[PDB]
Amino acid sequence: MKISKKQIEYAIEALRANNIITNDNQYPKVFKGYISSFGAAVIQSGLIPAIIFFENEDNDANADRHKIIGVLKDIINAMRQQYTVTDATILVSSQIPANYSMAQYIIEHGNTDQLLKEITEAAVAMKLALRMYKSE
Amino acid sequence: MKISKKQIEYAIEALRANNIITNDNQYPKVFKGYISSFGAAVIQSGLIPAIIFFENEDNDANADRHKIIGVLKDIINAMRQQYTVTDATILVSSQIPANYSMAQYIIEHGNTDQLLKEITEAAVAMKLALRMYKSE
Amino acid sequence: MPKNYTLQNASNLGWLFYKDYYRQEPNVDFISTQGKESDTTADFFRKTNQRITAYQLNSESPLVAAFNNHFGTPLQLKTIYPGLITGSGLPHQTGSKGEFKLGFQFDYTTGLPYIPGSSIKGTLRSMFPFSLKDKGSTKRILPEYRKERMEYIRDLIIEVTNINEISDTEIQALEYAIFTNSTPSGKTIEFSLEEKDVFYDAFVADSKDGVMLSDDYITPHGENPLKDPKPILFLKIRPDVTINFYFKLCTTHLYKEKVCSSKQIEEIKKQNDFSSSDYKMITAHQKRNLFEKILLCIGIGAKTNIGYGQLKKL
Amino acid sequence: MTTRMYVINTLSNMHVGSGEVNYGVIANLIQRDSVTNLPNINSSGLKGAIREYFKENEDLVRELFGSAPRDEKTLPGKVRFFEANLLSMPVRSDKVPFLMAISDEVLQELITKMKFFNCEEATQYISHLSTLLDNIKTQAQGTDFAYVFDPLLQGAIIEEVSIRATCPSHIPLQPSLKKLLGDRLVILSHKYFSILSDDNHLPVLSRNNLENGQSANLWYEQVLPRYSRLYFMLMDGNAQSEYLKKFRDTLCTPSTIIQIGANASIGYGYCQISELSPF
Amino acid sequence: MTTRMYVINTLSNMHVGSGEVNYGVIANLIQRDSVTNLPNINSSGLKGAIREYFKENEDLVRELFGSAPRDEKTLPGKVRFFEANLLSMPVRSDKVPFLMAISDEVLQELITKMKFFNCEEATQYISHLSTLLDNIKTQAQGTDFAYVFDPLLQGAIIEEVSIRATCPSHIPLQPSLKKLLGDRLVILSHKYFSILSDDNHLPVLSRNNLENGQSANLWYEQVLPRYSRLYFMLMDGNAQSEYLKKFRDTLCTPSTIIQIGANASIGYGYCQISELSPF
Amino acid sequence: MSKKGKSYVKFNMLLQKYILKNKDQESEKFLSSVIQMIRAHAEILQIILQNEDKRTEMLKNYFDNNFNESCHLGYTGLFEDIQTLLCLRYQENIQDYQNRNEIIQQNTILTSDEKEILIVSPAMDAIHTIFTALQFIHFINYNKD
């Protein structure tokens, strides 16, 4: 899997839009581990368990972990916005609702390989985008 | 290809300027592996992910890996300085700002075929120029 | 089906623990905060855990018999009770009630609990003086590390083999031959095919009368004793369970504090100036005894400092 | 006589590294076929491992494999080693611990390879495999399928809740095909097998580097699951008969175990090589 | 009975070295065409490989290929060999294991070459290929395209060039064109095929030399994907008809496998030569 | 070559050392890979030679870093001999030809083509001398068996 530069652009705007990256191009140092752990959880336990774990808002974590799931949703929406007409016949090009829970969206849409592939690519893009900035 | 002497000279000057080679013609050992791995990473992954990985500061590495990205930027700047300014030419001669990370420049300056060619040539020049010196 | 794992009627334990664990069932909710704390979710995870912890292993298991045929005669050691944990760092957690919060190391094909050969090799090497890498961060503790471990290795070698005296360079050469299969440096020794030390995967061999997997709790109490604790439920290998360690070990020949090949040592023996005082030999059986002593000393797995993963002789 | 098909049965988790940089979860990936994207062994790696096994017999290695690197006399090797392609992969289930999984495209590729290379005992295998593939295509009628040939494996979950096994009573499985492909065989669609063999579904092993009991490094390694079957082609390039006989005897001896891939010291790539049995 | 066209179907990865010193990552680059930069085989290597296959029949080699390099008397070769230009390449896909990739410029070059050389069965193939190319250009309307002709392959993604294929229903692909260009054929724009066949997207393999377990050397090799299709032209001069018939029968026999290129001992460059079938 | 200095002596000694004598007790094992290395890396060798302060160190480092394999441990003598000959030839060439080149270029009567025919590059001339010496050694040593 090769990460495109447009995916990294989407990741940068999504990390700024949620609030991972501050106005001085800095981020809390724990989001690096958050994204790495999300990738590991997706590869090991599965898409749904990892999404449920990192989507939870009533955490004991130092920072807001659910913002990485928000960044995921924004990156996936940006990726789907550029889907071609012939892609929309095979792939689902509908936009994920902003207030919708990502885990329940995945569950209602099944467990299709499209969603898992998009999540993995977006997680790698998030990791690469964080690698471009300073850890506080 | 064939070895470009001017690019080797640019590589020598950039290696000296980016504090790779000490006052004595000696460099830390791991930089050989850094330079060699950069081209393979560029080919196997994308150019953007490789530049992100090598430009990343605050990493856990035996030395300053971002110095090779600095050397690459200096060599590319020298090449663009020497570029012939004529109409009906493809190459863009504008220098890369010193306040700019290479990743950001490649991100907002796409259609990067020229940038890819320059980066590969600069990596080859760096690899061949590093052999004039000794590893501690 | 419920017990006696076998190959014809079983559910892959790794599959059950990782992929089938969080299956979406009607009326079961663990997406919402209410669902994660509900009793229905607790019952669902309780049933899944009971399915996980119901399998036994017979001594005459065709799986274990095939392992014995492929990897040779095993080293059988028995688990004592804190339990035994492997692969604790594997991500397995959602935030629900009654679920296993830590990971477990399962074989993909067979599904049996196992210890990877990398884990065994690292655990055995950690008790040797030259396991720590000479680095900027490690240079403060580097002298004490080697000084402490060299004495331990010396007494253990004197115990397991007939060698009366061993030098520091000899210990270094033996360690680098066993684990690196080279010289202390970067040089390669011309070794035969059989002159290699291989650390296979340790497998669960036989749960005599009972299941091989159980559930355990670690309940951290935070820095504030006035706040509530945090029950963490994980999966462990039950005590009184036989673990089969498989190795492929050779005979190490040391002459004048250097590791020699078998044909090299034959040629050295044939020479006129052959000093028998400078010749040392540790056989595969003595290597196995050394590894057994190390394992009985420190154990293997996760949370070994708090007791987990200690072994006794079968 | 010239061309023989050998089956590789792995006894542990096997890793033949591709050596490429992956900036995702898995730092070390395995070799994949350039065309079909399925796990494979490069013929160079196979030849190197087998040469390492036979290194003691200097005459046999010199005649069969060629001259050692940087020898004064460079003589070419006579036996030609072809890359090993994935035949069967174990898949986790709920009714049995693991099942032998092969796709229709893998079967078609095997049939085409046997047709092109003209193996020793290829005629009966091609006939029966073509009959089986035709029956499978007739039963499927263009849809996704997971066909088991044991009635007790009906409704088995093949590693994914979507994939469920159905037993077509009409399609027979010959005992020699069962021996070649593996017990508890399931025939999967190309989509199902590709999903089950992609980078998000292949087994990964987590490793960390400890310094004084404290973790320094951490990475994930992709592995080919234990008891996986791969087939490769061996061509007898006019090699000497007695050395060839010794080679095939040692290679096919049940006591012979060969290490292929990376992580030899920690027991990763240990395999058994079998010849294509007569039908 | 002159200047007929032969098609090369590769049974494995092919490496025909260019012999140019590349100081970048890929030290060993494959041979590429002078004008179109597409992978190719020089007629020198083709003649060498075919002579090596036929070297047992001394009289046939002497009559058709010429004379041995150290023969006292010299004899010119009577058969004219031509360079093998790439026709179809396999590309990864999601619905199928791979697709057969050809570009409109490749088709134009093939039509022009057939017109210039007037192959034995050239007329019908030229007419039908011109019709297909005209239909493709009519449907494309100057835009980038990826056209498949099996209706089941609609929406198949090319993995390297992340473009999904569309099915132009009114463009017919004849069975003889299917036999020539290959099954599961996708016709792309020139840019898509150039990106697919460039050095960055061709399969690159990492190799090393081990001395007692530790790596002595390391280099990167690029190869032509297995099942790649290449075509060359063969002109017979004042050659005897009996030897020519023997040569054509042996060359086009289904049991004949020719090794072209490097790395013969690790199964590289094994292919089958087929003649242009009558339309 | 100039017979004035020690470059001629070193050239003769290299020829004597690395040229095989007829079967008779051992020679110095000439390596043929250095012939193509010098040709391919000629411009880099020119860059190294033009560095006045670190010329010998840079040459030794370059030869060590390019020929960094196990087999090359037996060719250290050959590498050192060719390095010494290259340095001596470059020094003699600059001494003989530097001011000549400057004055030839500063001349206004001569045409550009005649100027380039008359002007000789010291470093490249020395490299060509080493290349030709090694080619002669290989030509004498090699036989098509």
Question: Residue C268: which residues within 8 A CB-CB, separation 6 or more?
Answer: C255, C260, C274, C279
Q: Which residues of C97-134 are buried (b: 16+ CB within 10 A; e: fewer)?
A: bbbbbbbbbbbbbbbbbbbbbbbbbbbbbbbbbbbbee
CB D4 within 8 A of CB D276: yes
F140: left (phi over 0), alpha (psi -120 to 50) or beta: alpha
For residue C245, give the H/E element and its range.
Answer: strand C241-245
Encoded tokens for E193: 């095929």
Encoded tokens for E272: 């089958």
| Model resolution, angstroms | 2.8
Q: For residue C33, how many other CB atoms are within 10 A of its CB?
A: 12
Question: Residue C98: which residues within 8 A CB-CB, separation 6 or more?
Answer: C41, C42, C43, C44, C45, C46, C49, C233
Per the CB < 8 Å rule, is C182 touching E213?
yes
Q: How far apart are CA A61 and CA D261, in angstroms?
A: 41
| CA dist B7 → B120, C235, F66, F137 (Å) | 11, 60, 19, 33
Q: 3-class DSSP state for residue E81?
A: strand
For residue C119, give the H/E element and its range.
Answer: helix C117-125
- With CA atoms as reference, the chain F residue closest to B2 would be F40
Q: 3-class DSSP state for residue C96?
A: coil
Find the helix packing angle between A30-44 and A47-55, rounded to 10°: 150
Place of tokens 């051992």: F26
- Give the neighbor-by-neighbor strand order of the sheet with C258-260: C258-260, C252-255, C279-282
Q: How far apart are CA A116 and CA A101, in angstroms?
A: 16
Select the residue of D12, D94, D206 nearest C11 (Cβ to Cβ): D94
Q: Report chain B's terminal Cα–Cα distance, integer Å.
A: 31
In terms of C-beta density within 10 A (0-12 exposed, 13-18 middle, 19 or more buried), how is residue B16 classed?
A: middle
Q: How far apart are CA C15 and CA B129, in angstroms?
A: 53
| DSSP single-letter state for residue C179 | I
Encoded tokens for E134: 């005209």
B/E touch flag: 3 or more CB pairs below 8 Å: yes
Q: How far apart are CA A39 and CA A128, in angstroms?
A: 12
- Residues of chain D contacting E265 with CB distance shorter than 8 Å: 47, 65-66, 76-77, 79-81, 237
Q: Report chain F's terminal Cα–Cα distance, integer Å.
A: 33
**With an 8 Å Cβ cutoff, is D27 touching chain C?**
no
In terms of C-beta density within 10 A (0-12 exposed, 13-18 middle, 19 or more buried), how is residue D238 classed?
A: exposed
**With an 8 Å Cβ cutoff, is E265 touching chain D?**
yes
Experimental technique for the deposited model:
cryo-EM
Encoded tokens for D117: 């290379």
- Residues of chain E contacting D16 with CB distance shorter than 8 Å: none
Per the CB < 8 Å rule, is A5 touching B103?
no
Place of tokens 């449907």: E139
Per the CB < 8 Å rule, is E212 touching C186?
no
Place of tokens 């057939």: E114
Q: Which residue, C183, C178, C184, is CA-closest to C196?
A: C178
**D246 backbone dihedrals φ, ψ, rounded to 5°:** -60, -40
Q: How far apart are CA C299 and CA C308, in angstroms?
A: 8
Per the CB < 8 Å rule, is B110 touching A135?
no
Per the CB < 8 Å rule, is F69 touching E21?
no
In terms of C-beta density within 10 A (0-12 exposed, 13-18 middle, 19 or more buried), how is residue C3 classed?
A: middle
Q: How far apart are CA F6 and CA A70, in angstroms?
A: 76
Q: How far apart are CA C142 and CA C160, in angstroms?
A: 27
Select the residue of D33, D44, D142 nearest E266 (Cβ to Cβ): D44
**With an 8 Å Cβ cutoff, is C22 touching chain A?**
yes
Pairing of strands D84-92, D270-275: unpaired
| B50 CA: distance to closest CA in chain D (Å) | 9
Select the residue of B56, B57, B107 nearest A5 (Cβ to Cβ): B107
Per the CB < 8 Å rule, is F61 touching B9?
no
- Residues of chain E contacting C190 with CB distance shorter than 8 Å: 212
Per the CB < 8 Å rule, is D20 touching B53?
no
Q: Which residue, A81, A101, A106, is CA-closest to A93?
A: A81
Give Rg (Cα) of chain B.
Answer: 15
**With an 8 Å Cβ cutoff, is F70 touching chain E?**
yes
Q: For residue C281, how many other CB atoms are within 10 A of its CB?
A: 15
Q: How far apart are CA E15 and CA E261, in angstroms?
A: 6
Select the residue of D23, D26, D160 nearest A128 (Cβ to Cβ): D23
Helix and strand element counts for chain C (H, E)? 9, 12
Q: 3-class DSSP state for residue C164?
A: coil
For residue F51, give the H/E element and its range.
Answer: none
Per the CB < 8 Å rule, is A40 touching D23?
no
Encoded tokens for A63: 């920072």
3-state secondary structure string, chain D?
CCEEEEEEEECCCECCECCCCCCCCEEECECECCCCCCEEECHHHHHHHHHHHCCCCHHHHHHHCCCCCCCCCCCCCCCEECCEEEEEEEEECCCCCEEEEEEHHHHHHHHHHHHHHCCCCHHHHHHHHHHHHHHHHHHHCCCCCEEECCHHHCCCECCCCCCECECCCCCCCCHHHHHHHCCCEEEECHHHHHHHHCCCCCCEEEEEEEECCEEEEEEEEECECCCCEEEEEEECCCCCHHHHHHHHHHHHCCCCCEECCCCCCCCCCEEEEEECCCC
**With an 8 Å Cβ cutoff, is C179 touching chain E?**
no
In terms of C-beta density within 10 A (0-12 exposed, 13-18 middle, 19 or more buried), how is residue E237 classed?
A: exposed
Place of tokens 């031509």: E82
Per the CB < 8 Å rule, is C5 touching D97?
yes
Interface test with E, best of C185, C188, C261 (most E CBs within 10 A): C188
Encoded tokens for A88: 């929309």
CB B133 within 8 A of CB F63: no
Q: Which residues of F29-55 are buried (b: 16+ CB within 10 A; e: fewer)?
A: ebbeebbebbeebbbbbbbbbeeeeeb
Q: How far apart are CA C284 and CA C247, in angstroms?
A: 9
- Residues of chain A contacting D215 with CB distance shorter than 8 Å: none
Within chain D, what is the greatest distance between any pair of CA atoms?
A: 63
**With an 8 Å Cβ cutoff, is D208 touching chain A?**
no
